[PDB]
Amino acid sequence: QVQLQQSGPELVKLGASVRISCKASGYRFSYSWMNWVKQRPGKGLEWIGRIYPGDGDTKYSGKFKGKATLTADKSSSTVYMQLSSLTSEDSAVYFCARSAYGSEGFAMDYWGQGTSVT
Amino acid sequence: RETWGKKVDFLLSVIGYAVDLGNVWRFPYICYQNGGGAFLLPYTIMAIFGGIPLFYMELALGQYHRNGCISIWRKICPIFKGIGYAICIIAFYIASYYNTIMAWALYYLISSFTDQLPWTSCKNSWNTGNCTNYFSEDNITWTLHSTSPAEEFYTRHVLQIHRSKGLQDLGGISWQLALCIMLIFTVIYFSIWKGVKTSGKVVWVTATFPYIILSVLLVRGATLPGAWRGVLFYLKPNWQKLLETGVWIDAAAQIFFSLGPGFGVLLAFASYNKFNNNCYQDALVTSVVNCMTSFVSGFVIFTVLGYMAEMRNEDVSEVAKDAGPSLLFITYAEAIANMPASTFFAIIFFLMLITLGLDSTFAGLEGVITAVLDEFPHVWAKRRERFVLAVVITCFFGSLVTLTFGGAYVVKLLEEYATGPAVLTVALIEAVAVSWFYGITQFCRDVKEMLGFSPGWFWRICWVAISPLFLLFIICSFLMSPPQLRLFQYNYPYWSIILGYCIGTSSFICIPTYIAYRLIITPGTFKERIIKSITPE
Amino acid sequence: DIVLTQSPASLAVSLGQRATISCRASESVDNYGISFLNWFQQKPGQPPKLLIYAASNQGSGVPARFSGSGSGTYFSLNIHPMEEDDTAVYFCQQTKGVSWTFGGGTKVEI
Ligand SMILES: *[C@@H]1O[C@H](CO)[C@@H](O[C@@H]2O[C@H](CO)[C@@H](O)[C@H](O)[C@H]2NC(C)=O)[C@H](O)[C@H]1NC(C)=O
Ligand SMILES: CC(C)CCC[C@@H](C)[C@H]1CC[C@H]2[C@@H]3CC=C4C[C@@H](O)CC[C@]4(C)[C@H]3CC[C@]12C
Ligand SMILES: CCCCCCCCCCCC
Ligand SMILES: CCCCCCCCCCCC
Ligand SMILES: CCCCCCCCCCCC
Ligand SMILES: CCCCCCCCCC
Ligand SMILES: CCCCCCC
Ligand SMILES: CCCCCCC
Ligand SMILES: CCCCCCC
Ligand SMILES: CCCCCCC
Ligand SMILES: CCCCCCC
Ligand SMILES: CCCCC
């Protein structure tokens, strides 16, 4: 069900690195994708990348492959997002969505609480 | 007329036509469907009794007459001349049904180029909910609607049946399959335009490749753990249900379609050279090598199926019970996905399929393109290239009916209706014209001194009673028992069954309507009419 | 990367009248007869909420007032006259491979 719990807020410094966790439970997470979005205060939504837990298939885009890395953990049923070279421009809140199946059009039905990384 | 030239090339072309992707598709599938082990024991004797006469007599008639396949009947029984148009229509239907499978195979070969083949895991274009078949440790929970990644790849990628609700509902366009069909037809035209020279030149280079691919696939499957349950299921006697409700009629139809007698192609190939002292040997060698190739194909199919069943820890029967054409394209797909030597085995297997299908459809189209030219001398004079272009045009136009439909429904309809009763009664009419109407005595008195041996005591008693008796029993049993259609949990309606029966009974009405035309153009009364019309020139 | 554009940017309609949301692009995202498009409901402070399945089917837990259709390049979001609480920004998401991009966003207010 809706159990995509995340961590609290982190601290951002010039040239730092943080880790955002996403505990997934209540469904077959080994066969469903895991999306990560970026939302700035007072701005729209921005896509970061997708990860497929179980096979390591990652498809990075949005000019974020140079500073973001997705890592899945089937044993702990968590999804990690590695951050690097943090700056006040990209310092914003990040969510943790879950894509739907193929016939459903891969719609982010279940969302997370949100990590206010500021 | 034209001469084959190299005897080795001729025999190699015959055996390359005998080996068929259609046979590789039908034989193991229907075998596993009807029970597996209870398919090979009552198989060899029926194969002999059904193909050996229909092959040897046809090859002998061709090498004796050497005037094509449509005009050859003018010197035997001009009343049955409609069998030429029957063979033409049947070959056209076979090509229309076969080009879609060829396009599927070539599209699979194209899509099997990436390092991450789309068979190990379902990608972002298929239902990941239904997609659950992954060999883990206590992670699978099969339900009443469990599918496979290969099943989804065959269903919602190349065929896209999810958009077609049945035969009564149309389907969407398939530009990829259209371009694949265009490329395949261009290759076929460029290979068949020149003539018998390129015919013999293209066959000998794509003849040993399917054999070596089959051998390497067999030696690879003989190593994977779990190849015992497959061969045990493939070699079970099962004498319980072969007496009355058996699969004997389907086995007969399958071996008939595999050896391909009466399809006009063998007659057209024998209609080139006299080929003295080698007809019987050629027929026997071709039939033996075709039976051995079919046996090896069934062996590797059941080996892969048993390996998959032992890896899944479940019976062999449940694996793809309803998937008719999808069986092969999911079983070998999962085999390549599970074997650590992927991205090469799938490529070589698809290339073997492409070569075999090319050889088969090329022989099938040649057996008509060299037979209609003898009936049309004004065309054969100059317009051979234009007639080849026109027959390719109409062939891919007929294939477009199944292409645009976006479903294997018409494919299965042509699979169990076109190459069944129509060609069956065509072979029956041919055998009747050869045995009853034409004198077997004068039919064999020449081949006796041509081959130096006596064909008596076997064919003198096989061509008259047992072969036509079996060939009529199969067709009357087929007409009595409706072969109910099933594909992808979709029962074909009574209107579809009626349409299949109608196309099956109309694919050979040309012979009786030509008989009626000849009877009405010939004046007089019945007795003198028949006695002066049945005159072998 | 395929970019999505939304229009208009703000819809200051009152209570009792319907509205339409447009999401255009060069695509033509139609693949296998499934229009790859998803509409979200993002409230200030709250995480987004899915509304439409494949731009043709309604989501789970969403009232029947939310609807929409379209095919190919043109996509519309025909929404029933909203209430005093249904005012929020809406985004259209293209899920066609291999990259996923979100829309601009409309200011649905009263
Ligand atoms: C597995 O596939 C089956 C289809 O065979 C799915 O079942 C269907 O569910 C949809 C939506 O609820 C219906 O429109 C169909 O009519 C159903 N078909 C049948 C045969 O029941 C099933 O939902 C799929 N399972 C998963 C987990 O994706
Ligand atoms: C180890 C095994 C599987 C490999 C051998 C495959 C066999 C069945 C196939 C592959 C090549 C085929 C041969 C190709 C060429 C010719 C020459 C021709 O004039 C007679 C048939 C003959 C002799 C074929 C007989 C069957 C053949 C030998
Ligand atoms: C599949 C095995 C086919 C074997 C064919 C043998 C034919 C023998 C004919 C003997 C005639 C005297
Ligand atoms: C990426 C495009 C690859 C195209 C490969 C075409 C291969 C055609 C083979 C034809 C065999 C008869
Ligand atoms: C998106 C995958 C497209 C695959 C197209 C295969 C056919 C390419 C043209 C081949 C011409 C011979
Ligand atoms: C040389 C051009 C031949 C054109 C043949 C067209 C046949 C159409 C059949 C429907
Ligand atoms: C609607 C068309 C039904 C028959 C298809 C094959 C000719
Ligand atoms: C999109 C339809 C293509 C038809 C091709 C006919 C040759
Ligand atoms: C020009 C003929 C090409 C045949 C290719 C067969 C694979
Ligand atoms: C170009 C559309 C052809 C439709 C054929 C339906 C059988
Ligand atoms: C409805 C398509 C034609 C059916 C003919 C049945 C004889
Ligand atoms: C693969 C195309 C070959 C044309 C001769």
Residue numbers in the entry:
A (entry chain B): 20 to 137
B (entry chain A): 79 to 615
C (entry chain C): 21 to 130
The publication says:
The serotonin transporter (SERT) terminates serotonin signaling by using sodium and chloride gradients to drive reuptake of serotonin into presynaptic neurons and is the target of widely used medications to treat neuropsychiatric disorders.
To understand how Na+ might prime SERT for subsequent 5-HT capture, we investigated the structural conformations of apo SERT in the presence of NaCl. Accordingly, we define this class as having an occluded conformation. We propose that Na+-bound apo SERT is in a dynamic equilibrium with multiple conformations and that, once the transporter visits an outward-facing conformation and 5-HT binds to the central site from either bulk solution or the allosteric site, the transporter becomes primed for a cycle of substrate translocation.
